Each structure stands twice: as structure tokens, then as C-alpha cells.
Structure 1
Amino acid sequence: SHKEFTKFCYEVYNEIKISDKEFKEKRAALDTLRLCLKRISPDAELVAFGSLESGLALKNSDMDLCVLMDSRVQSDTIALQFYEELIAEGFEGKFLQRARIPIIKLTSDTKNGFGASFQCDIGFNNRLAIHNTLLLSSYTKLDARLKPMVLLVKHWAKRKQINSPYFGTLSSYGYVLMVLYYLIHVIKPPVFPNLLLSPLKQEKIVDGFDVGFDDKLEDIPPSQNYSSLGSLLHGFFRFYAYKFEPREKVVTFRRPDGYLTKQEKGWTRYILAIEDPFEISHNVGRTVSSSGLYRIRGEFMAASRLLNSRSYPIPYDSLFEEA
């Protein structure tokens, strides 16, 4: 069945998704930050990537921006100028540089009225993140069930304290890939095809990596999987609870059958292995510790048990209760 659970899922979905109102304030915030960039560099562009761009944002969403420019112009100099304009415009934040990568972290806004806790990260020529976001955007457009599924999983993972990359668990991006991987390579019939392995896929190389995938989305047949949202979620919790073998396997988008061992990859951290679809050298689950993985797995199991439970009524609410 899953009829009541599905109904419940859409109810929570409508409560947790970014309201149209907040979306518009974030968009106005973007226009403001672009005006400040025009004052410093007329030829640079400021693009949004990540969850706001792909439509996978919860309420109180952070903003992820990227500055594009001529590669022959050094990003640290324009970054510092952009930072000084932002301070002068009444934004508060930090300017930092890990290795050769400059980053601005905006933490507040004191004048333009976008919040006392306005959070916004700004990178420089982070072209790979843009492409990651193009991929997720295209899937989101491809099946309407992806968006609610992702948000519910994100919301679940926050409530269970298993969404902390700094404390031994997994990033939200990591959970998006686990979902997508399930929808492409596990569920039968598949919900989505692998756009990177499409025969129609055209190679496009950016910063050393191949970011090509099939984006002629209107030519793709709709899914032959008719599962309800509730059923997809249960399938997803079931798979990572009982079927997926984190000790030996890699979540991957580069194999026709989704099979990849850690040994082929040389991934002896790699407690949990998720191969970024484009940046294949990057293990998205590298933040996941031993105890972190134990808790992630246990929560997957507990979510399965709950949806499989025989005691009626099933306390669906306890899926989003704090651990």
C-alpha cells in the first residue's frame, strides 16, 4: 500500500520546502550582490548553484554562489575587492583562502534587509559545482517525485543527527547522491536513466573532469516506475538498511549496473564511499567515521522497521523526531 504514508509525506513536504516568499528574498539578495560585483568587475558573472538552483531547498536555506571570470585573472585579487565592497555594503562575513581557493563566507546583513542571519558562501571559478547542479536540476525536471523525496530524506537526516560532515556523518549532497543512485541503479523498473552513460551523451571537459550528460530532457521517455512517493522512500530506507554493503561497495554513477568495489577504486577516509559523478577522485562520504556510519546504518534500519511495522496506527511522525 503506502497510501497513508504517501499522504503524510506530501504533508511534511509542503511544510518543509522553501516557501515562494523566501525564494523571492533570496533572488533579490542575488540581484544586490550582483550590483556590488558590477562595481568591482564589469565582466565577471555571479551564478547560484546547489540546492536553491536545483529546487531542492528546505526552509532557512543557505546560499551557494560562484563568481565566474577570465581564468588568466587571479581570483584572490578580485575576491578581496569583492569582499571589501560587501563589507561597505553592510554585509558581514569572512574572507579566507584554503590552498589556492579563495572563499567569502557571508554570515549576516545589516542594511539591505535580507536577515540578521543571512548565510551565503561565495566561491571563485568553481565550475564543477555548477555542473553538479546542472545534473541535479535536470533529474528534478525529469520526475516530479525526486524533489519531495530529497527534501524528506534531508529533513530525516537532520532530525536524526546524521547530517553533520564535521562530526563524522554525511553532507546533504551525499544524501542526494544516495537517493539518485537508488533511483537509477537499484529500483526496478528504474525511476531515472543514467544521463552520464546515455548513448546521446557528449563529452565536455572542465577542470580536468568530464561533466557531459544527456540534457535533451524532452526526448527522454517518462519513467516506467509508478511507485508512490511513500513506496520509493521505503524502498530507499530498505536498500541502505539491509542490501547495500558499505564495507565493500561504492555508490557510483559511472557503471551501467551500479557495481563498483572500493578495491577497483583504491579506496581503503573511505568508511563510506560515494563517488562524485563528475569529480570521480572525490569521495563524498570521506567525512563519514566508523561511529558515524554505525548511526547512519541504524537510522536507515529504524526507518525501515517503522514503515514495515504492524502495530496500528503506525507512528509516521517518529520518522522526523529528533534522535
Structure 2
Amino acid sequence: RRRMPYSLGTDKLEKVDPDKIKSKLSEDVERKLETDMRELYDRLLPTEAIEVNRRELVSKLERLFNTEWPGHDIRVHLFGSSGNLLCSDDSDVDICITTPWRELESVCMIAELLDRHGMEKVVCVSAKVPIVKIWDPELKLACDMNVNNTLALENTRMVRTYVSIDDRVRPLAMIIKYWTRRRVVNDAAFGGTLSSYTWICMIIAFLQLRDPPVLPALHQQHDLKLVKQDGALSDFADDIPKLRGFGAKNKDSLAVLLFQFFRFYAHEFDYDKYTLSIRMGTLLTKAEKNWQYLVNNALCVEEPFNDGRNLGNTADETSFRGLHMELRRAFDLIAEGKLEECCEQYVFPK
């Protein structure tokens, strides 16, 4: 299911004359783009009826696990879009199951239990982190779940903190995520594109590099870190009420930020030289991380909790060329306020 066909080649896109790149939206385009974005954001927001279904699934799973394997304090947690304020009604339910009972990390044992109790399309992937995928026919929800993936819970908590800092982040990130789904550039497993978490990091990194910045570098704000419930200091600043309002110095609207996001990644950002690091909040070079030797390093996005891992390693040179075309395609359409055409649903050739 290769998203970017090998026929694209690997050539770098041309450097367009800077005078031919639109510098800012016109007054009419921004006003219409602003209303079109807030109308779409209202459609993208989740509904209460589906929110209670996701909580019913969590409770149903937690009862099934504790009744089948009692005495192990098995708890079910939401993470990803389900826990960072960025999910929609059609989003999957991403679940992290925790227990001190290490035997539960054999996930096909979980797959058998859920299939035995009526779940459908039950597949286990025993893989980076083992995953059980189900489809709940009663609640009409798809669910991916892993066991003791505490890293996913922490960086979900980091994304949620970033979303809580500035009220423009949630609508901006949800609209961009919607764009990644419509263009089908959010499949790092089979399509060769970028993961949902990779895109969120690219959004945060863009917001950190604005002048003035919309978001801070939470990993570097040492004086704003709280003691977690395990007794350890949080790796990132998480004092949300004290962090709120950090981006108020930036006066750009939602419409301008969407325009600048695509403009940044279409023409401004030098993909060949720099690594995007939301951990540092500044640009790093590939050379200072020795990342000029990484295979699939055309796009370097540093994972904040493991600076030795490039989130963009799922994109080869052909996939990156197609990804760069989509970002330039998006920039040209948003520069004219064409939000609907920017989000045209991609369809795979037969």
C-alpha cells in the first residue's frame, strides 16, 4: 500500500524564487479562511455520546481483564488521540494496559479473551510494542491496545500539556491531522509516510519557532516541572495553569498559523540541514546528531524522550519527495483560502 509511488523519483524539489512565494494572506482570504476553519473545527470536535462510548469500552475491558486474571491490579488507560484532546468521533481508541504482572505482555492471550467475549477483527502483533486490535460491534469502536507501554502515556501527557498551553493549538492541530487523514499521509506502518505522533511533533516544532513563539520548550523549562506521582521530576514542564498564556505574545490568528505551517514546511524549512526538536525548542543540525548517516533521514524529527530516534525514519527518499509535494500543494491552496480543496480525499489508484 505504498502511498508515494517509486515513479516519483528522489529529486529534491526546486528552490522557488522567494519573491514568488506569497508572504501573507490578504485581508479577505484570512477572514474567510478563519470562518471556514472554525466551522470545520466544530465538525471535528467529539460528541458526548461517542465520548461515553470510549469510556464504556475502557470500563468493559478493565472488567474483562480483572475478572479473567484477578489479583494483578490491571488498569486500562487512554493514550494518543484519545488522551491528548485531539481525537474525533471516528478516531480509534488507543489503549495502554498496565499491571505489575509481566505475563500480560503476551498480547495474543488478550486477543483470545476478547475474541472469546464477542470482539471482532481480533488480531495480535507480537513488533516494536505488541498490539491487539479489535472492533467492538456493540460500541462501534476500533481499538488498538498494548501492555505496559509507559512511554506512550508520558508523551501523550506531553502533547496534552502542549495543547493546553494555547487555545489555538487544539483547532490548528485537529485541522492539520484531518488534512493528513484526507491526503492519506499518516500511515507510517504500511504507506511509508509519517505517524500521527510525527505530525504532532512537526506542528509543535513549528509553533515553537514562531516569532514570538506560540509554544515553549517544556523539556527545557526546568523551573516549571512538577514531581510525578512516582516521586520523580517530570522530564518536561507540566505546571499547566502557570504555563497557560505563554503564546499570548503571538497575535496571529488560526488562519495565519495554518498558512504559516504549510509555508514553513513547503518552502522555508531546510530539510537537508536541520533536525526538528521539540525537546530543545530550537533547530538542531543533522551533523551535530550524526544523523547524516541515518538511512531515511531526508526528514529528521527528533523524538523528545529518546533523542537518538528519528520519527521521520519511516519515509524514504521517494516518500519524502511526495510528502514535500503534498505540503507545497497544501501551501498553494491555503494561500488562496481553499480549505476544502486542500483537504480533498486522496484515493489509491486501482
Q: Same fold by TM (over 0.5)? A: yes
Q: How does 1:143-154 map to 2 (within 5 A)?
A: 143-154=166-177
* Equivalent position of 2:63 in the other structure: 35
AA aligned to 1:30 is V
SS at match of 1:193: coil
5+ residue gaps, structure 2, are 1-26
AA aligned to 2:288 is E
Give the whole-Å Cα distance in 1 for the aligned partners of 2:177 and 2:124: 29
Report the alpha carbon displacement of residue 80 of structure 1 after superposing the two structures with TM.
4.7
Report the alpha carbon displacement of residue 238 of structure 1 after superposing the two structures with TM.
0.7
**Inter-CA distance 65–274: structure 2 relative to 1 (3 Å threshold):** same
Give the whole-Å Cα distance in 2 for the aligned partners of 1:263 and 1:201: 31
Report the alpha carbon displacement of residue 212 of structure 1 after superposing the two structures with TM.
1.0
* Equivalent position of 2:219 in the other structure: 196
Q: Would you say 1:95 and 2:115 are equivalent positions?
A: no
* Equivalent position of 1:60 in the other structure: 90
CA contact (8 A) 1:201 1:212 kept: no
* Equivalent position of 1:172 in the other structure: 196
Question: Structure 1 residue runs of 4+, over 6 Å off?
Answer: none
* Equivalent position of 1:288 in the other structure: 315
* Equivalent position of 1:157 in the other structure: 180
AA aligned to 2:55 is R
Q: How does 1:1-323 map to 2 (within 5 A)?
A: 1=27, 2-39=30-67, 40-42=69-71, 43-70=73-100, 73-77=102-106, 79-92=107-120, 93-98=122-127, 101-106=129-134, 108-110=135-137, 113-115=138-140, 118-165=141-188, 166-184=190-208, 186-202=209-225, 212-220=235-243, 222=245, 223=247, 224-256=249-281, 258-267=282-291, 268=293, 269-309=296-336, 314-323=337-346
**Inter-CA distance 62–98: structure 2 relative to 1 (3 Å threshold):** same
Give the whole-Å Cα distance in 2 for the aligned partners of 1:88 and 1:33: 13
AA aligned to 1:8 is D
Give the whole-Å Cα distance in 1 for the aligned partners of 2:88 and 2:278: 25
CA contact (8 A) 2:97 2:147 kept: yes
Deviation string 1:94-141 (CA, Å, 9 cap, x unpaired) is: 233137x443221x234xx112xx321111110000001001111122
Report the alpha carbon displacement of residue 192 of structure 1 after superposing the two structures with TM.
1.3
Report the alpha carbon displacement of residue 4 of structure 1 after superposing the two structures with TM.
1.3
Give the TM-score, by structure 2 length: 0.81
Give the whole-Å Cα distance in 1 for the aligned partners of 2:184 and 2:143: 23
Give the whole-Å Cα distance in 2 for the aligned partners of 1:244 and 1:28: 44
Report the alpha carbon displacement of residue 221 of structure 1 after superposing the two structures with TM.
5.1
CA contact (8 A) 2:226 2:239 kept: no
Report the alpha carbon displacement of residue 316 of structure 1 after superposing the two structures with TM.
3.3
Report the alpha carbon displacement of residue 304 of structure 1 after superposing the two structures with TM.
2.1
Identical counterparts, % of pairs: 27
Give the TM-score, by structure 1 length: 0.87
Report the alpha carbon displacement of residue 88 of structure 1 after superposing the two structures with TM.
2.2
CA contact (8 A) 2:279 2:304 kept: yes
Give the whole-Å Cα distance in 1 for the aligned partners of 2:194 and 2:227: 29
Report the alpha carbon displacement of residue 83 of structure 1 after superposing the two structures with TM.
3.1
Give the whole-Å Cα distance in 2 for the aligned partners of 1:262 and 1:235: 24
**Inter-CA distance 37–87: structure 2 relative to 1 (3 Å threshold):** same
RMSD of aligned residue pairs (Cα, Å)? 2.2
How many residue pairs end up in the alignment? 305
Report the alpha carbon displacement of residue 6 of structure 1 after superposing the two structures with TM.
0.9
Give the whole-Å Cα distance in 1 for the aligned partners of 2:64 and 2:97: 12
Give the whole-Å Cα distance in 1 for the aligned partners of 2:163 and 2:225: 20
